[PDB]
Design a protein around this nucleic acid. Sequence first.
DNA 1: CCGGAGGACAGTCCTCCGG
DNA 2: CCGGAGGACTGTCCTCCGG
Lengths: 57, 57
Amino acid sequence: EQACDICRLKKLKCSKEKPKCAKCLKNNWECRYSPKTKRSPLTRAHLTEVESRLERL
Amino acid sequence: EQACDICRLKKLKCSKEKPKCAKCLKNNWECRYSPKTKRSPLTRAHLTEVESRLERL
DNA sequence: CCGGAGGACAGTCCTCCGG
DNA sequence: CCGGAGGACTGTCCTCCGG
């Protein structure tokens, strides 16, 4: 499912074949399929927490 | 057709029948269907705008 | 090139059961 | 009194379309 970094960067269709996907292979570009990087919980708790820690001070 | 506030904080079934749902008619209580609580948007930019604006204090 | 559909999915948001 | 289950809804987050 996870398209590579470069087709990601590019908003294109990845073929998804590890080691180097079709376009990287053929273009001798680095095929890195990087991890999905973690964000903050987008939870009503964490929004009103932090929008009220801020507006308080 | 939304529950009234007494049944609401008592977590009871409402008949939602305006102006007086059955329990407040039967029981002679003030019935109020106070309106849609507006909140801030649990969207990503607003979470981020705000923790950035707190990380900046 | 890159905004946006398309959509599966996460976490809300109210309600009322049943202990 | 209330924990949290059930369900519609809201917005996400990912990918790849299509001008």
